[PDB]
Design a protein around this motif. Structure first.
Motif, mmCIF file in Angstrom:
data_model
loop_
_atom_site.group_PDB
_atom_site.id
_atom_site.type_symbol
_atom_site.label_atom_id
_atom_site.label_comp_id
_atom_site.label_asym_id
_atom_site.label_seq_id
_atom_site.Cartn_x
_atom_site.Cartn_y
_atom_site.Cartn_z
ATOM 1 N N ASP A 69 30.751 50.615 47.093
ATOM 2 C CA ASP A 69 30.233 51.562 46.113
ATOM 3 C C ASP A 69 30.046 52.941 46.728
ATOM 4 O O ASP A 69 30.370 53.957 46.103
ATOM 5 N N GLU A 70 29.522 52.998 47.952
ATOM 6 C CA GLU A 70 29.334 54.285 48.609
ATOM 7 C C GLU A 70 30.667 54.980 48.849
ATOM 8 O O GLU A 70 30.796 56.188 48.620
ATOM 9 N N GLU A 71 31.672 54.235 49.313
ATOM 10 C CA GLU A 71 32.982 54.835 49.545
ATOM 11 C C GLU A 71 33.586 55.352 48.249
ATOM 12 O O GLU A 71 34.157 56.448 48.213
ATOM 13 N N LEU A 72 33.486 54.570 47.176
ATOM 14 C CA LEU A 72 34.039 55.004 45.902
ATOM 15 C C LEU A 72 33.339 56.258 45.406
ATOM 16 O O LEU A 72 33.988 57.184 44.908
ATOM 17 N N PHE A 89 38.239 58.716 34.760
ATOM 18 C CA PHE A 89 39.663 58.724 35.078
ATOM 19 C C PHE A 89 39.891 58.707 36.585
ATOM 20 O O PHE A 89 40.717 57.935 37.092
ATOM 21 N N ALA A 90 39.150 59.540 37.321
ATOM 22 C CA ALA A 90 39.275 59.562 38.776
ATOM 23 C C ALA A 90 38.901 58.218 39.386
ATOM 24 O O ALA A 90 39.567 57.736 40.313
ATOM 25 N N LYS A 91 37.829 57.604 38.886
ATOM 26 C CA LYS A 91 37.424 56.298 39.384
ATOM 27 C C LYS A 91 38.519 55.268 39.170
ATOM 28 O O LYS A 91 38.796 54.453 40.054
ATOM 29 N N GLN A 92 39.147 55.280 37.995
ATOM 30 C CA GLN A 92 40.234 54.342 37.747
ATOM 31 C C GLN A 92 41.391 54.580 38.703
ATOM 32 O O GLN A 92 41.992 53.628 39.213
ATOM 33 N N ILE A 124 38.514 67.822 42.185
ATOM 34 C CA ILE A 124 38.381 66.392 41.946
ATOM 35 C C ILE A 124 39.631 65.867 41.263
ATOM 36 O O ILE A 124 40.276 64.927 41.742
ATOM 37 N N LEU A 125 40.049 66.529 40.184
ATOM 38 C CA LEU A 125 41.206 66.038 39.452
ATOM 39 C C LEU A 125 42.433 66.032 40.343
ATOM 40 O O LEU A 125 43.178 65.047 40.378
ATOM 41 N N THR A 126 42.622 67.095 41.127
ATOM 42 C CA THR A 126 43.784 67.133 42.001
ATOM 43 C C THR A 126 43.766 65.943 42.940
ATOM 44 O O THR A 126 44.777 65.251 43.099
ATOM 45 N N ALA A 127 42.599 65.642 43.511
ATOM 46 C CA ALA A 127 42.517 64.510 44.417
ATOM 47 C C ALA A 127 42.900 63.233 43.697
ATOM 48 O O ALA A 127 43.677 62.426 44.219
ATOM 49 N N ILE A 152 35.140 59.859 44.738
ATOM 50 C CA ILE A 152 35.096 60.491 43.423
ATOM 51 C C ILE A 152 34.517 61.892 43.521
ATOM 52 O O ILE A 152 35.028 62.831 42.903
ATOM 53 N N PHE A 153 33.442 62.061 44.282
ATOM 54 C CA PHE A 153 32.823 63.371 44.416
ATOM 55 C C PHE A 153 33.457 64.224 45.506
ATOM 56 O O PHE A 153 33.033 65.367 45.694
#
Ligand code: MG
Ligand code: ZN
Lengths: 50, 78, 35, 61, 304, 544, 702, 236
Positions: free
Chosen positions: G617-620, G603-606, G568-571, G624-625
């Protein structure tokens, strides 16, 4: 069983016979001049209490 | 273990009539000298004895003895 | 899971990890007596 | 700083690599025109290793 | 704008026809790689293998874009030659430092091709500090995948020293792999009948003509292949697609059969039996659909 | 024998042959190195059945096999000599071996009398012995048919992996090739995998599916609305004989009934060849289990049917995986932070309640109000409280699993749990709940200097968390001291493993040597040497 | 100790031990050899006087001190009764240069003693072999003291002067007092009522440099042994700690430090802001009261705070430099951490800047990448700047039931383009009698030889070639190249003397093939089981196919949670890899994390919201996941559910298939017993052990 | 988060204190202390060897003029050529008899040797950070090199670990048998006493025999009751 830690040690207040490789080795060796775990079972508890 | 009249450990060949080569392969390191001293004569039946002399163990297919019947072949004529 | 003949079940004992195969080998009186 | 394509999707990243290493533009300005995740990571994390000059001759007696 | 821009072309078609076109493109359109590589001189800070693997994947279609058809049919080849040393200013190697030659492959002519100026702003290698006393130079040559190295072609390399080439080629020839090595010019998919091309547009030449040439080549090859398609009508040997009239059962075990029968109402996979009536198959209708799809693809590409 | 007088065990003398574990007998007579052998890393292949083994090219071009010269094969041998395919030639009447070259030898030196032989490159479907080490039981060494393959690894079917205890993280296996005709016959019959299907003692099959296949099985039995085309897509090359009697919609039960091509009854599982249990789980399709369907098929007819069912069912399971796929994601484990926060707050409250109870008792004892308990009893009471907390966490995890199954029936993680593969409430408790009490030899860590374990706690500390009770979960992340206790347990386990690895081998060898010569005689009796051990072999005089 | 044994320092405790560094080996050897030299001279003089007269000193005994042989034997690996001090450096990794010099060995104890915590890495220990539990690794914040003789004397004199001056009337109790020792030398006995002050006042003076040394150790033993111990010697373990003075954390009462920390170094902080940090050795630590963290300290009452002497640093500073390569080791099981530390040293890296100059064995990574999800220790030690892997795209799914039991699927075009490509380099050496080198006779083994009898540059050697002409006189007796693959002659060096010495450096590039071994930073190791073409892999709506496919079940059966987080963080880093100033910005995810998962998700969301401001919302949530719908390449239809799909830093290990392959048909024999010989490099056979013999007898195949 | 910043500050280089690379710093110094300072102190000795008459006729051996020099080539040259990387140490030795006379001191030379031009001692040299040795104070650092290795005679690179000393700092307790215990410890001279002296003592206690609470060693001290020994030493 030995290499996957199948058996887990436990603490007890009375004499017990153990599980695992060590007990099997003891049985096979048949060493003399050692203590043995004698069990007594009854239905009249006075004989055991004495 | 209780084949004899008394229990016998697995580390010793005490009651069983094991062969000298069987003891040596088990790891005795002195069986041959004692056999020489006592002048022991033994047969060859164990797996260890058979492996030593390149014989077929008495196990599975080798549990039997095989012959060849030449009667029919000698009754044929060119 | 479900139980059908639980009195005859057989348990599995197989380590998940095993050791990789082996590779080719390739006086000042200044110590305690240690009795 | 050596490969000329992305190893994941095979796209061409040599122009952006020049824009980054030689002209020393900002990473943001460079990436403005790169969309795929793999390509962005490659342009952001790839380096040319540190090395000394080669001792010559290569065959010495 | 930028020297390079990423773009997509999207078209809507029947799912089976779209899958057919996608797999046809991935099977029949092969761009050769520069995998026949010889390093003649290397006193740089990088070993031979790094140079060779880096040069094997040079994006050459943006330089030889005028000879797409013949390269695709393998009637013509190409090569690149590099010779570059350290310098006080501009101490690095770009893609403008090579020389690109086209090989006729009939008369074995070797002719030089023009270089765009935009190539001056690409990067391959950065030299170390400039020392006048020492030497830091690289020289190499590379041929595309299909070329055959014999004295006839070697006699045409007037820009080389033939003896050095002979020695080094005799050194490397035993590790060059014998079979054909290629790449797909751009990316093509079709999720649910939505055919998509992911492509790259460069500033110095027109992308539509190149796209048209590739599409025409693909269409011709696909039509010929369809015409030469035959389904065995004997028993099933579990090796090729076949039809059993006795039971009326079709064994599907290849892609073209799968795509056509699915185009005519079946739902088959690639190693499976199905109860299908072969009389519903009409090759001419399929070919007409393919031609219409190709026209629609060209129309889509035109509106970029 | 220098050791008679001295005490150095390095000098070489006559007795050196029988010095110790390095005897001559047990390193060169009952063991040796051989000529036709190989060893290499292994890998999986889906084109190889349990009866076959894939051989790399670099081994095929070195190993050679024997063709004897007799009336049946003489012409073929002559043709082979003509084609430059013979590598060696053996003249039996002279006991002379010649290395027949390729254009570098003589044709007249060959005379091909009966009893001679020639050696050529090894051919496919030749039986080769192979195995993995350590060879703990009968199934680590088997003879299988050779199949050509790619790469430089020895390819095996995943169907035999458990019987050898093998995986593909770097394991290796070895091969040998004995070509004596008697050995050839015995390899073809006795050591063939199809003959070793049922385990010697408990009788369950030794071959079966593994890992994701299990889930596929569980899923296949549950799929409901399928047309004929989808059924045939699943079936693949085994769908020729499928009979759509009169139906237009099919279920996974229909597919299983087709696969079990028999009408047999067994209390529980089957009735008229159909599955009457609620679900298909690991006990059905994994090796060494007590409900295997291959076992029932073998009991009904023979081992050939069992092996056929194993192969066919594995094929269809993998086709289901190819068509529908399977994967676990992070959103299956932790969609949001509600349940974890709830359980964390519960733990934070309960631990403090336990601490307050203990402190109240200690303060009462410190004054003259009650006689103190013994150390053992006090430890027992504290342990009981902590165990109650752990069981509370267990119950929370179970209820959460049930509720999630209700709300989100297609959870891959819960699919794994239901199918019976590696997931259960305790592992989920570790991941999401609490880590619990860490023990060494069945008791927590011992105090060492100031009545404590680490200087993060005061001298004579009574805090339970300071003696190895871990409160956090893996999702939360352990702290430094909790990490210390965890690593204590882990490293102790590893060291014990090494020591036991050393000892068990010695005991096993002794036992094997002792019982090795006990067999069944010609009347179904168990005897050793000249003594009768048991009248009836297995109490029944039937194969075990 | 007779009556309370468990409360007295055990013999295996680190409280009662000291450690030898490089210099001390040489010091001890010099001492011993000098003594032996003088003894031999004395014996020679005595003998000469006994036999002859005039006390003549024989020559040839005062010219051989004997140090040369001692140092040579030391470097060979012999030092008193130990045999592990030194060894030949195996050039596996660039980080080994750090890992080996920072190890500590113990004489043959294998249990994890509590006193090794916080000063040695908890997870970096051998997992098998005879060394299990006998080698430990320092933490990133630990060190070992050094001190000179003159400094030792000055420091001891200052300490004695302080004791005798400031406590004149209360150092002569001797009957009911606390004895004060300096290096176990009793120098005074203090009045009990003044012990605490004496320590406190002492430590303060220590932190100001009053004694000229900031590493002096002072311990107050009080159970009932009642001693004050002062240590100054060398060979002690020391760490920095935060100071707690009279129930008060000094770090929180120094406002200027926060503003000035940027432009100051560590020693500047020590000099200008004393009483914030104290250097504490292990023995002093074992008897103090230490709060585990600053956050836990701030939650205590003042009365509770008054009992503590020090406060510890975050947990990420309790790992070694090897363990700092991993991510979030405290979110996984411990055994996985042990294995990860074991394999992190075997990953292939940028081994040396003298790749083309040094004539040595080694393995080098060809197109390196710098990791961007790291800890600070990996940045300061330079392990990160020298690279040990590459960023690749992975999908967690089952592929046709092929990738099972740790096998992996890898993409063909990824390998062709240079993915995780390495070069192996090897060194060959021969010695030749001069006549044989100059002997004039073309055998089939001398195809690669030039007119001067030496192999040609850039040629490829095969499994029967020789590197230098060596004819014994009309027979060829030269050594032969014996690898199943070829190699290119990179360098040749020759020395001419009575004999001829030839050294050759060869290189070979090795693209991945079946059987090659890879792993992640969470101990997920696997071999290549299938090389899939780009057109045979599932793809997403952007047309991206994974470079590697790994089975997802093992992630959750082994409980390697951190791996998921890493992806996740790498993405997130790929979506927004720069600061608000536009500078490249790595993401800090230390081993021993201590940060919350929710904060990482925020942080990933930002990052994603900055990238694409217009997302549903679904795409975000899917981004994120790291979830995507993948399609079947054969039919172009979606799979049942979404798949975990994203980038990650991937490592290649040094275990290669062709280095382990072996085969024998016929060959040499051992002379005594006449059986196949041994040695893979000598064409030996495989041994048929007696356990295999037991198995074959179990089949009944006589 | 200030504690995290303070922790980070310890890992970065500290030029003011001469720390250019923290991870291996303590090793570099550990060698710089030996090659520069301790070797000279160990070698430079002036000791009697034999004595005669009564402390008026004794032979004396003295060592002085200790010099150490580095090689003339870089470690890369040593690797390529196949040489070794060692430093050369030389010293001068004097053997002379001395006779004590009321007039002062009498000196009569017997022998003297020098190693001005010889490989008298060859000491392996540590490569160190930047391919830089303590003897050579050059001004060029090879980047990405941290050193920590030695090159032996055969041009092979060597590396070593740390080891735990055999002498402990607390007495060792041991239960010899039921109600019979022992307590052993050691004594060693300070650093500035050449040669160093060692002593190893054991205290034995047995409940059955409380009159034999005895301190002892091996052929270096008497077996005496410890309480009476303390009485003798402290006069109490
Ligand atoms: Mg394994
Ligand atoms: Zn890309």
């Amino acid at each position: 069983q030995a290499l996957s830690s199948f058996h887990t040690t436990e603490k007890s207040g009375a004499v017990k016979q153990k599980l695992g490789f060590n007990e099997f080795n003891n049985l096979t060796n048949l060493s003399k001049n050692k203590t043995e775990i004698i069990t007594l079972v009854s239905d009249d508890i006075s004989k055991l209490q004495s | 273990l209780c084949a004899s009249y008394e229990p016998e450990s697995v580390n010793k060949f005490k009651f069983g009539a094991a062969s000298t080569l069987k003891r040596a392969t088990f790891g005795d390191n002195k069986a041959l000298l004692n056999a020489a001293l006592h002048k022991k004569s033994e047969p060859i039946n164990d797996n260890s004895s058979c492996h030593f002399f390149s014989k077929v163990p008495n196990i599975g297919t080798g549990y039997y003895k095989y012959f060849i019947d030449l009667g029919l072949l000698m009754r044929m004529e060119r | 899971t479900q139980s059908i003949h639980e009195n005859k079940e057989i348990t599995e004992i197989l380590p998940d990890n095993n050791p990789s195969p082996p590779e080719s080998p390739e006086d000042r009186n200044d110590e305690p007596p240690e009795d | 700083v050596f490969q000329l394509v992305c190893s994941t999707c095979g796209k061409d990243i040599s122009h952006e690599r020049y824009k980054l290493i030689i002209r020393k533009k900002s990473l943001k300005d460079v990436l403005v025109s790169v969309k795929n995740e793999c390509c962005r990571l490659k342009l952001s994390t790839q380096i040319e290793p540190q090395r000394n000059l080669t001792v010559q001759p290569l065959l010495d007696i | 704008q930028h020297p390079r821009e990423e773009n997509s072309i999207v078209v809507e078609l029947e799912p089976s026809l779209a899958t057919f076109i996608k797999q046809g493109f991935n099977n029949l359109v092969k761009w050769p790689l520069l995998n026949i590589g010889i390093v003649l001189s290397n006193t740089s800070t990088a070993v031979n293998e790094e140079w060779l693997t880096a040069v094997e994947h040079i994006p050459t279609m943006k330089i030889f874009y005028k000879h797409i058809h013949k390269i695709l049919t393998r009637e013509m080849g190409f090569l690149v030659y590099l010779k570059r040393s350290q310098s006080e200013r501009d101490n690095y190697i770009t893609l403008y430092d090579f020389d690109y030659y086209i090989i006729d492959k009939d008369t074995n002519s070797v002719t030089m091709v023009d270089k765009p100026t935009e190539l001056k702003e690409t990067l391959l290698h950065v030299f170390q500090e400039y020392r006048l006393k020492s030497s830091q130079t690289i020289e190499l040559i590379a041929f595309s995948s299909g070329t055959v190295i014999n004295e006839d072609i070697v006699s045409k390399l007037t820009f080389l020293d033939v003896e050095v080439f002979n020695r080094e080629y005799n050194n490397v020839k035993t590790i060059i792999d014998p079979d054909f090595v290629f790449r797909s010019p751009f990316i093509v998919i079709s999720p649910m009948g939505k055919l998509t091309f992911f492509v790259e547009v460069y500033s110095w030449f027109d992308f539509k003509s190149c796209f048209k040439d590739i599409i025409d080549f693909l269409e011709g090859a696909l039509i010929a292949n369809i015409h030469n398609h035959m389904i065995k009508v004997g028993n099933c040997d579990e090796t090729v697609s076949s039809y059993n009239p006795e039971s009326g059962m079709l064994f599907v075990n290849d892609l073209m059969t799968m795509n056509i029968v699915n185009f005519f109402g079946c739902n088959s996979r690639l190693e499976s039996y199905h109860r299908f009536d072969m009389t519903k198959v009409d090759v001419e209708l399929f070919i007409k659909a393919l031609s219409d799809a190709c026209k629609k693809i060209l129309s889509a590409s035109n509106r970029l | 024998d220098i050791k008679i007088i001295s005490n150095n065990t390095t000098s070489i003398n006559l007795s050196y042959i029988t010095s110790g574990k390095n005897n001559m007998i047990r390193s060169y007579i009952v063991a040796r190195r051989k000529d036709q052998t190989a060893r290499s890393v292994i890998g999986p292949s889906t084109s190889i059945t349990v009866n076959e083994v894939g051989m790399p090219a670099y081994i095929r071009n070195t190993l050679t096999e024997k063709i004897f010269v007799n009336a049946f094969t003489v012409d073929k041998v002559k043709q082979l000599l003509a084609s430059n395919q013979v590598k060696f030639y053996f003249n039996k009447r002279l006991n002379q071996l010649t290395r027949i070259r390729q254009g570098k030898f003589i044709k007249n030196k060959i005379h091909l009398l009966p009893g001679d032989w020639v050696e050529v490159a090894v051919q496919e479907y030749t039986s080769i012995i192979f195995g993995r080490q350590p060879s703990l039981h009968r199934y680590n060494v088997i003879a299988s048919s050779i199949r050509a393959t790619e790469g430089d690894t020895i390819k095996i079917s995943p169907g035999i992996a458990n019987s050898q205890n093998a995986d593909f993280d770097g394991d290796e296996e070895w091969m040998i090739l004995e070509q004596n005709p008697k050995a050839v016959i015995e390899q073809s019959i006795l050591m063939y995998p199809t003959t070793l299907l049922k385990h010697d003692i408990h009788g369950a099959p030794v071959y079966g599916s593994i890992q994701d296949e299990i889930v596929a099985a569980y899923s296949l039995f549950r799929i409901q609305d399928l047309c004929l085309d989808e059924v045939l897509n699943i079936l693949g090359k085994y769908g020729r004989e499928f009979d759509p009697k009169g139906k237009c919609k099919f279920s996974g039960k229909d597919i299983y009934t087709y696969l079990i091509g028999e009408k047999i009854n067994y209390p529980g599982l089957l009735k008229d060849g159909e599955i009457i249990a609620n679900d298909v789980d690991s006990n059905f399709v994994v090796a060494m289990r007590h409900l295997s369907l291959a076992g029932l098929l073998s009991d009904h007819k023979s081992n050939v049917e069992g092996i056929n069912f194993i192969i066919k069912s594995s094929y269809v399971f993998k086709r289901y995986l190819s068509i529908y796929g399977f994967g676990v994601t992070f959103k299956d484990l932790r969609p949001n932070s509600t349940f974890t926060n709830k359980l964390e707050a519960i733990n934070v409250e309960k631990i403090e309640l336990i601490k307050e109870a203990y402190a109240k008792y200690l303060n009462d004892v410190r004054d003259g109000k009650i006689v103190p308990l013994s150390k053992a009893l006090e430890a027992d009471y504290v342990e009981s409280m902590l165990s109650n907390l752990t069981n509370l966490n267990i119950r929370e995890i179970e209820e959460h699993m049930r509720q999630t199954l209700i709300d989100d029936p297609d959870n891959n993680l819960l699919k794994m749990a239901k199918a019976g593969y590696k997931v259960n409430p305790t592992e989920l408790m570790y991941i999401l709940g609490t880590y619990g009490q860490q023990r060494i030899d069945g008791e927590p860590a011992e105090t060492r200097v100031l009545g404590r374990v680490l200087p993060y706690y005061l001298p004579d500390s009574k805090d339970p968390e300071g003696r190895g009770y871990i409160l956090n979960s893996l999702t939360k992340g352990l702290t430094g001291s909790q990490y210390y206790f965890s690593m204590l347990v882990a490293r102790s386990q590893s060291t014990d493993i090494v020591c036991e690895t050393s000892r068990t081998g010695t005991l096993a060898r002794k036992i094997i040597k002792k019982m090795e010569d006990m067999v069944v005689d010609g009347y179904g009796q168990v005897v050793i040497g000249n003594t009768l051990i048991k009248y009836a072999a297995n109490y029944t005089k039937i194969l075990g | 100790c007779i009556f309370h044994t468990s409360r007295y320092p055990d013999r295996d405790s680190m409280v009662c031990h000291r450690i030898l560094t490089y210099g001390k080996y040489f010091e001890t050897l010099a001492h011993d050899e000098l003594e032996n030299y003088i003894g031999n001279i004395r014996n020679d003089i005595m003998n000469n006087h006994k036999n002859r007269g005039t006390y003549a000193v024989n020559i040839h005994v005062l010219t051989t001190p004997g140090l040369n042989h001692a140092f040579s034997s030391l470097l060979s690996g012999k030092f008193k009764k130990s045999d592990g001090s030194y060894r030949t450096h195996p050039h596996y990794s660039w980080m080994q240069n750090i890992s080996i010099p920072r190890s500590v060995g113990f004489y043959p104890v294998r249990k994890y003693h509590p006193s090794q915590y916080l000063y040695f890495c908890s997870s970096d220990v051998p997992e098998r072999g005879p060394q299990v539990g006998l080698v430990s690794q320092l933490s990133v914040l630990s060190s070992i003291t050094n001190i000179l003789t003159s400094e030792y004397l000055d420091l001891e004199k200052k300490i004695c002067e302080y004791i005798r001056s400031y406590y004149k009337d209360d150092i002569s109790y001797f009957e009911t007092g606390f004895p004060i020792t300096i290096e176990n030398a009793l120098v005074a006995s203090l009045n009990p009522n003044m012990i605490c002050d004496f320590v406190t006042d002492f430590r303060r003076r220590k932190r100001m440099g009053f004694f000229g040394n900031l590493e002096v150790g002072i311990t107050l033993v009080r159970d009932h042994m009642n001693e004050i111990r002062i240590n100054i010697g060398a060979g002690r373990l020391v760490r920095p700690f935060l100071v707690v003075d009279n129930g008060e954390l000094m770090m929180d009462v120094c406002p200027e430090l926060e503003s000035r920390l940027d432009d100051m170094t560590f020693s500047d902080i020590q000099k200008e802001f004393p009483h914030v940090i104290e250097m504490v050795d292990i023995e002093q630590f074992t008897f103090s009261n230490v709060c585990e963290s600053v956050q836990k300290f701030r939650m205590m009452s003042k009365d509770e705070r008054k009992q503590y002497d020090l406060c510890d640093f975050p947990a990420e500073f309790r790992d070694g430099y090897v363990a700092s390569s991993l991510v979030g080791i405290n979110h996984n099981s411990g055994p996985r951490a042990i294995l990860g530390c074991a394999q992190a040293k075997q990953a292939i890296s940028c081994l040396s800047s003298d790749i083309r100059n040094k004539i040595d064995n080694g393995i080098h990574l060809m197109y390196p990448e710098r990791p961007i999800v790291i800890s600070k220790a990996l940045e300061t030690s330079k392990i990160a700047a020298n690279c040990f892997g590459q960023h690749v795209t992975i999908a967690l799914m089952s592929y046709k039931g092929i990738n099972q039991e740790d096998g992996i699927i890898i993409k063909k075009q990824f390998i062709q383009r240079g993915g995780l490509d390495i070069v192996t380099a090897k060194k060959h050496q021969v010695e030749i009698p001069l006549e044989n080198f100059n002997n004039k006779e073309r055998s089939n083994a001398y195809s690669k030889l030039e007119s001067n009898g030496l192999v040609r540059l850039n040629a490829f050697l095969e499994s029967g070639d020789a590197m230098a002409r060596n004819i014994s006189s009309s027979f060829d007796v030269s050594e032969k190249y014996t690898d199943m693959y070829k190699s290119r002659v990179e360098r040749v060096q020759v020395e001419l003397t009575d004999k001829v010495k030839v050294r050759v450096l060869t290189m070979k590039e090795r693209r991945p093939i079946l059987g090659d071994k890879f792993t992640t930073r969470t101990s997920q190791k696997g071999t290549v089981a299938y090389v899939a073409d780009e057109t045979e892999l599932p793809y997403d709506e952007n047309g991206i196919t994974p470079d590697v496919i790994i089975n997802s079940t093992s992630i959750f059966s082994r409980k390697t949670i951190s791996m998921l987080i890493e992806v996740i963080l790498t993405a997130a880093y790929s979506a927004k890899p720069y600061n608000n100033k536009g500078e490249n910005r790595p993401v800090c995810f230390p081993s021993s994390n201590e940060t919350s998962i929710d904060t990482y998700m925020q942080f990933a969301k930002q990052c994603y919201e900055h990238s694409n401001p217009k997302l549903s919302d679904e795409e975000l949530s899917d981004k994120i996941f790291c979830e995507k719908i993948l399609y079947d390449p054969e039919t172009d239809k979606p799979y049942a559910s979404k798949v975990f799909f994203g980038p990650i830093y991937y490592l290649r290990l040094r275990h290669l298939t062709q280095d382990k392959a072996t085969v024998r048909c016929r060959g040499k024999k051992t002379k005594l017993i006449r059986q196949a010989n041994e040695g893979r490099k000598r064409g030996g056979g495989i041994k048929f052990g007696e356990m295999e013999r037991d198995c074959l007898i179990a089949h009944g195949a006589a | 988060e200030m504690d995290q910043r303070l922790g980070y500050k310890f890992l970065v280089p500290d030029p003011k204190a001469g720390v250019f690379y923290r991870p291996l710093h303590f090793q570099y110094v550990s060698y710089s202390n030996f090659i520069l300072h301790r070797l000279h102190e160990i070698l430079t000795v002036k000791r009697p060897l034999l004595s005669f008459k009564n402390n008026t006729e004794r032979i004396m051996i003295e060592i002085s003029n200790v010099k150490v020099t580095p090689p003339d080539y870089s470690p890369i040259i040593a690797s390529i050529k196949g040489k070794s990387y060692d430093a050369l140490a030389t010293f001068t030795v004097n053997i002379f008899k001395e006779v004590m006379t009321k007039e002062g001191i009498s000196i009569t030379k017997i022998s003297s040797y020098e190693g001005k031009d010889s490989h008298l001692i060859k000491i392996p040299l540590l490569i160190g950070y930047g391919n830089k040795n303590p003897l050579d104070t050059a001004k060029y650092l090879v980047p990405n090199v941290i050193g920590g290795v030695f090159i032996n005679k055969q041009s092979v690179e060597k590396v070593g670990i740390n080891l735990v000393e055999k002498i402990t700092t607390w007495p060792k307790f041991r239960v010899v048998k039921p109600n019979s215990f022992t307590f052993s410890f050691s004594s060693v001279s300070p650093p500035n006493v050449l040669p160093t002296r060692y002593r190893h003592y054991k205290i034995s206690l047995d409940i059955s025999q409380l009159e034999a609470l005895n301190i002892s060693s091996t052929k270096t001290f008497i077996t005496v009751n410890i309480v009476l020994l303390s009485q003798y030493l402290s006069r109490v």
